[PDB]
Amino acid sequence: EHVAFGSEDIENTLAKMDDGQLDGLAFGAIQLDGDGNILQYNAAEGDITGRDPKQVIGKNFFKDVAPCTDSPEFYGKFKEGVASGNLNTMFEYTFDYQMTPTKVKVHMKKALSGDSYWVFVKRV
Numbered sequence: 001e002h003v004a005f006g007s008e009d010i011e012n013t014l015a016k017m018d019d020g021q022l023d024g025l026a027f028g029a030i031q032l033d034g035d036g037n038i039l040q041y042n043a044a045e046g047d048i049t050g051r052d053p054k055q056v057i058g059k060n061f062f063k064d065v066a067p068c069t070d071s072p073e074f075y076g077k078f079k080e081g082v083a084s085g086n087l088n089t090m091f092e093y094t095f096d097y098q099m100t101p102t103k104v105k106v107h108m109k110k111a112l113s114g115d116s117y118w119v120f121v122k123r124v
């Protein structure tokens with residue numbers, strides 16, 4: 001159905017969803033493993049960044065796809081959350097690698113499932 005960016009139970013709703021439903025979301029959604037490998041990447045995220053979802057699946061988000069996120073403010077918070085088991089943070093960021101610099105809001109949250117973490121993205 002509809003689900004709003006930043007919803008308190010977003011991870012419960014998205015646990016229900018297959019690839020096609022994820023492509024129906026109003027915001028960008030990326031699912032990562034604990035090493036930052038890309039497990040899912042939806043159509044809305046591709047609309048923001050110009051990346052073909054089919055070609056980024058399996059690549060490492062912090063090393064290869066999104067080097068500008070390798071920073072204490074983004075990757076640093078991700079690794080702290082993976083280690084502590086409590087990842088749930090929202091912040092503003094700029095995506096500027098091989099693209100027009102684009103201001104975004106990012107929400108990172110642990111999934112329901114084992115060894116999975118979401119990055120949600122919306123333009124601001």
Ligand SMILES: *C(=O)/C=C/c1ccc(O)cc1
Pocket residue numbers: 045046049051065066067068069094095096097
């Ligand atoms: C900075 O390098 C960010 C790059 C980026 C962010 C999000 C994406 O889905 C793809 C590339």
